[PDB]
Amino acid sequence: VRIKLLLECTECKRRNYATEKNKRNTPNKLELRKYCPWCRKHTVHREVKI
Amino acid sequence: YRLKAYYREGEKPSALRRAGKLPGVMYNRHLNRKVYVDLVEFDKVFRQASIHHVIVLELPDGQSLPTLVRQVNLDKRRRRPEHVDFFVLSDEPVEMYVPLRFVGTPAGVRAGGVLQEIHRDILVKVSPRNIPEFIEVDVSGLEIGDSLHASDLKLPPGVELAVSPEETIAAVVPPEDVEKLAEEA
Amino acid sequence: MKEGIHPKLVPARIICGCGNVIETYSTKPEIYVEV
Amino acid sequence: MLMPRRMKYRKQQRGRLKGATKGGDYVAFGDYGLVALEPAWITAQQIEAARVAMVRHFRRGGKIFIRIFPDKPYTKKPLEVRMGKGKGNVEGYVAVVKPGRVMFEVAGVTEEQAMEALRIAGHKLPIKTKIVRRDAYDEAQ
Amino acid sequence: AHKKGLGSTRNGRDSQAKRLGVKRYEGQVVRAGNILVRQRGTRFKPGKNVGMGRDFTLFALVDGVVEFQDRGRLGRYVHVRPLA
Amino acid sequence: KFRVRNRIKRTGRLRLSVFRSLKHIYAQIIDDEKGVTLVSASSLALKLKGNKTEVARQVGRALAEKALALGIKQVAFDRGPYKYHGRVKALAEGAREGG
Amino acid sequence: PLDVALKRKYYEEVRPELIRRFGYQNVWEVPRLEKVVINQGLGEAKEDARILEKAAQELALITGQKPAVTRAKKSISNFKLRKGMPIGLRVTLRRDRMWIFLEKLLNVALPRIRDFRGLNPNSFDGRGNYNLGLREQLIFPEITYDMVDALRGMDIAVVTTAETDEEARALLELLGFPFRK
RNA sequence: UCCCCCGUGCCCAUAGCGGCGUGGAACCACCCGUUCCCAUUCCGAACACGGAAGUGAAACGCGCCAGCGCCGAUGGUACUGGGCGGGCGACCGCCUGGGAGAGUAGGUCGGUGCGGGGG
RNA sequence: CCACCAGCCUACCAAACCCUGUCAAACUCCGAAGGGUCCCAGGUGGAGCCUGGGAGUGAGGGCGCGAGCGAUAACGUCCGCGU
RNA sequence: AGAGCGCAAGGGUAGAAGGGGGCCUGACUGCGAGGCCUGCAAGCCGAGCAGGGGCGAAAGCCGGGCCUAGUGAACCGGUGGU
């Protein structure tokens, strides 16, 4: 169920993804959690859309 | 008491019982010799037995030694003996079951009541030199419900005990009737 | 009882209503009571 | 009557009735008692048939030790109805008893009395019976 | 035919029995990958050259010879020793 | 009561089963399987100095040279209620390299 | 080694009274103090929770040692609160601290128990411990009026090294306790 | 080569629960101090750090008792691949190889590699 | 039957407790028979392997014993190895 | 070890998978040995490797959570992007 809406953590550097899920019912805002894209290393990873 | 017991070998105990010479095993400390009694007189003299007596086995080997019973095998179906174990005796204090000669007709008794013979056999240790036949337990002033137990009985100087001491040896209870049609509900 | 904001210690009296001069070491600097 | 009021599995199957008493065919209780002869279920309603004519015939009598407890559901199903549609309901609460199993005894009564009383009492019980004392029934608790 | 009152149920559903048990026994050779036990709880516990992923399941790391281990005061183990 | 088999975490590979008991530090190296041991370095039973943290230091690297004489390389520091208090002997510069 | 009036008291007092009416001929068997713990077991911080805790922290000030908020464990359906995290303060106190504690205690706390007829010689745990309860929190010398709200007692938890009756009550009587008789 | 104690693995309660007895000169546990590493969801409890006095009490190492715990023969039944039959049935018997539980007897308060500290 | 708090109890109701008997598929302290699988060896047999084309065949039914449903009724009817 | 282990049980579990805390953020990238399962199609456990990163002195751990459900082939499209 939503209020926990899902998102695809898009990274900077012009794309590269890892897929997750939020939590609106929790104080969780946007999320720039440290993950590793298809190209490079454990750099950044932010949050976009659904 | 007396009972001719013949040695056993390696035959099938099936034949034994169904021929008369009834299969039974005896042991003691290290031994576990193989013999058999007979159908008729073993069963007869066993009514006079139980682990209250000293049974002699007169083995046709020139030996004749006493034992006490232990672990009897009934045939379940058509219930009647099909094996007996015999623990041999010594003379250093060992353990068996004492019978309780109930002596006394109290007040719950007589004025109704039903006898409650609980541990008709109690676990006790005696020196096999003095093998006391029985011990008389007395009801005397016992009303329906109440009970007799522990150190209320007789203990011959050579007789020492070990059961609870608590455990009820005997008691009395209400005798039922047709006013249970009223209870029926 | 190290930690941080521990409520302190320090000496104190017991100037009772009888004539007691008991020496103590309690959280309050100056106390006095009955007996 | 008497039985459990709420056990585990209400609808419980029948199974199989082979033999051996499972244990409990000695005496250990009353003066004179009754032993089964046919390996099967045995009714509670019949247990109380027994106890009825028994304790009835001998009013002001002794005491009864019934070592039998009838708690196995009957799988009984409606009349004038088709097959399937469900499984039988927990009717007739009976017990698993084979021959030998010293069903039930009494004490505080005289020989001839226990003889006749248990004779009719057991007579009622849905089979054939045997009547036992307390002699060669020694030691096997 | 006057079929008096009937009934219905809910007890018609049954979970699908997925294949369970140990796959190898003392002797066989695993080759890194050859899983050996589809178990629930630690009915058998890993040790030498034996792994255990996410489902409680012991498997292969080396080209090993299977063996068991009785330990009681810890349970039962499954060990593997290849060549050495 | 720090059993846990913290020594199951020391089932891992190779062992250095120590145990300080008030006065002497009973530090030891054990090879496994065979249950055959190796080293029994100590403080006061070693007939060296007499303090906890000092001997430790030195004895730690004593062990260094020891193992580097017997062609080993690494093992594993072991105790129930260890907590690790450096003692930068910490038997790793002491041979093991594991520090 | 902070010296208090009860320290030097219990000091000499315990030893030869025990050496004379008793005597465990082995210098280290005579049992003495141990742990002085206190716990009030409310459950009335159903809500208003930790505002009812500040009432209990000024208590931590009177002894001089911070407390730990211990809690419930199950699912209560009467006085509310399930899971288990209410107002069950368990405060732990030791050697020199229990000394100033039971100093103000045995010297000036027990006299204003207006119901005073003596400590209970029956609330012993027979293992060298002595639990009981009380009614007012202001019976402890350093908490004036302008601070107390409703009602607040506590359940005194004093454990000793002792483990037999007569000597438990004896240690306490050698410490200066106001018991029954 | 051996006895004792302290670190340890291993068989996996015949290993332990209780009771009684015993040493600490060594190792050991306390103990004392919290100046100091550490740290208390609060507590010198603790995990530690600084070691005189003193202790063998709690811990422990060892024994003596079966009282509980556990192990438990085997004489022997229950049953069971295989095969053969009796009755309407439910079930039952025969020959063969196998063959427990129960508890009867009895047993055991255990033993073994490595390492070190002492004679 | 008193309060410094308690003393006290019944041929009264009444849990825990144990002894005596105890039943269970979804209860398991023990657990067979057998069955299943891998190694060695024998086993020469309308065996087994691989590939390819050519097939069909998928309401099965009396019997035995292992369980169910029925009602410990059915030429009932649903699985099981076996026939 | 009958407690607790999100929600059904079963099973397993304290020599943790439970309960508290410090630093993070491996519900990673490229793969994939080999097995379980099974007509297919999916489902499934995953040594070990190369980049890089967290923790821990280190040994070593991290490709989600004790586990057995929390699912939808393919086209037809929608957004960001090569």
- Provide residues of E within 8 Å CB-CB of chain D: 1-9
Q: Which helix (H) or strand (E) holds G130?
A: strand G129-131
CB atoms within 10 A of CB D69: 14
Distance from residue E17 (CA) to nucleotide J12 (C1'), in Å? 19
Q: Domains, chain D, ranges and CATH?
A: 29-137 (3.90.1170.10)
How far the first Cα of chain D sits from its last, in Å, is 28
In chain A, what is the greatest distance between 2 CA atoms, to the nearest angstrom?
A: 34
- Tokens for D27, please give them: 């005496």
Q: For the purposes of burial, counting CB atoms within 10 Å of the CB of B154, is it exposed (0-12), middle (13-18) or buried (19 or more)?
A: middle
Instruction: Provide DSSP, B26-95.
Output: E--TT---EEE--HHHHHHHHHT-STTS-EEE--TTT--EEEE---EEE-STT--EEEEEEEE--SS-EE
Could you check: is the Cβ of residue F16 within 7 Å of any atom of nucleic acid strand J? no
Separation of alpha carbons G170 and G177, rounded Å: 10
Of E44, E41, E35, the C-alpha closest to E70 is E44
Residues G60, G94: Cα–Cα separation, whole Å: 14
**Is the CB of D85 less than 8 angstroms away from the CB of E7?**
yes
Q: How far is C27 from chain G (nearest CA, A)?
A: 6
Tokens linked to B127: 């020196």
Task: List the single residue in D19, D99, D108 with the smallest CB-CB distance to B175.
Answer: D108
End-to-end CA distance of chain G: 34
Testing the interface with C: which of G4, G106, G108, G142 to mutate, by most C Cβ within 10 A? G108
Is G73 in contact with G94 (CB distance < 8 Å)? no
Q: Which residues of C are annotated as a binding site?
A: 16, 18
Q: What was the structure determination method?
A: X-ray
- Other chains touching D, judged by 3 or more CB pairs under 8 Å: B, E
DSSP lists the bridge partners of residue B123 as B97
Do the chains contact at G108 and C35, CB–CB below 8 Å? yes
Q: What angle do CA G132, G58, C21 make, to 5 degrees?
A: 75
3-state secondary structure of G39: strand
Amino acid in the structure at residue B57: L
- As a whole number of angstroms, the distance between CA F93 and CA F58 comes to 11
SS3 D44: helix
- Are the beta carbons of D80 and E2 separated by less than 8 Å? yes
Which residue of D55, D107, D139 is in closest CB contact with B178?
A: D55
Query: CA–C1' distance G95–H36 (Å)?
Result: 21
| Cα–Cα dist G57/G36, whole Å | 17
CB B65 within 8 A of CB B96: no
In 10 A of CB B45, how many CB atoms?
15
For every residue of E28-71, which 3-state class applies, written as one string? CECCCCCCCEECCCCCCEECCCEEECCCCCEEECCCCEEEEEEC
Residues 6+ apart with CB under 8 A from D129: D34, D35, D36, D37, D122, D123
By the 8 A CB rule, do G171 and G22 touch? no
Q: Are B174 and B115 contacting, i.e. CB atoms less than 8 angstroms apart?
A: no
D130 contacts: CB under 8 Å, gap ≥ 6: D34, D35, D36, D37
Q: Which two tokens stand for residue B91?
A: 């003379």
As a whole number of angstroms, the distance between CA F78 and CA F29 comes to 9
What are the backbone angles phi and psi of residue B15, rounded to the nearest 5°? -55, -45
Q: How far apart are CA G38 and CA B183, in angstroms?
A: 58
Of B155, B150, B142, nearest to B116 (Cα)? B142
Chains contacting chain E through 3 or more C-beta pairs under 8 A: D
Tokens representing B25 are: 């095993």
Q: Which residues of the protein are close to the nucleic strand I, CB under 7 angstroms?
A: B 143, 167; D 8-9, 11-17, 21-24, 26, 28-29, 40-41, 67, 69, 71-72, 74-77, 83-84, 86-88, 95-96, 140-141; E 25, 27-28; G 117-118, 122, 180-181
**Measured between CB atoms, does D79 come within 8 Å of chain E?**
yes
Contact D93, D72 (CB under 8 A): yes
In eight-state DSSP terms, residue G109 is: I
Token reading at A4: 């926990």
Rounded distance between C-alpha atoms, residue B77 and residue D101, angstroms: 9
Q: Tokens 């211990």 label which residue?
A: G70
Name which of F67, F22, F73, F2 is nearest F41 in CA terms: F67
Q: Do E9 and D86 make contact, defined as CB atoms within 8 angstroms?
A: yes
- H/E element holding F64? helix F52-69
Report the distance separating Cα B107 and Cα B143, nearest Å. 5
For residue D59, CA distances in Å to B112, D110, E35, G167 come to 12, 14, 75, 66
Q: How far is CA D100 from CA B77, D1, D107, in A?
A: 6, 24, 20
Burial of G32 (0-12, 13-18, 19+ CB in 10 A): middle
In G, minimum Cα distance to C23 occurs at G5
Sequence-ordered strand ranges (E) for chain F: 16-17, 20-21, 24-25, 29-30, 38-39, 77-78
- What's G108's DSSP letter? I
The residue type at F85: H
Positive or negative, the Cα torsion across G32, G36, G41, G42?
A: positive
Residue D82 tokens, joined: 């088709």
Nearest to E61, CA basis, from E46, E69, E73, E49: E49
Q: What number of other Cβ atoms are within 10 A of residue F74's Cβ?
A: 13
Residue of C nearest to G96 (CA): C25
The helix (H) or strand (E) run that includes residue G95 is helix G95-104
F24-25 and E58-60 strand pairing: unpaired
Strands (E), D73-115: 74-76, 89-91, 95-97, 102-107
Cβ of A35 less than 7 A from strand J: yes
Output the known binding site of C for Zn(2+). 16, 18
CB B61 within 8 A of CB B44: no
Instruction: Label the pairing between strands B168-173 and B147-149.
Output: antiparallel
Beta bridge partners of B148: B170
- Tokens 């207006």 sit on residue: G114
3-state secondary structure of D41: strand
Q: Please tell me the distance from the alpha carbon of residue G174 to that of residue G178, in angstroms, as a whole number.
A: 11
Q: Which residues of C touch G (CB under 8 A)?
A: 1, 3, 5-9, 14, 16, 22-28, 31, 33-35
Q: Which of G28, G3, G30 is nearest to G171 (CA)?
A: G30
Residue B141: alpha-carbon gap to chain centroid:
27
What the block records as the tokens of G48 is: 């208003």
> Cα separation of G34 and G160, whole Å?
5
Crossing angle of helices G95-104/G54-63, nearest 10°? 100
Cβ neighbours for D66, distance < 8 A, ≥ 6 positions apart: D47, D51, D103, D104
Partner-chain contact E4 D82, CB within 8 Å: no
G12 close to C (CB below 8 A): no
For the segment 13-42 of chain E, residues whose CB is within 7 A of strand J: 18-19, 23, 30-35, 38, 40-42
How far is it, in rounded angstroms, from Cα G78 to Cα G181? 40
Q: How would you classify the pairing of strands B2-3 and G88-93?
A: unpaired
Query: Contact at 8 Å (CB) between D135 and D122?
Result: no
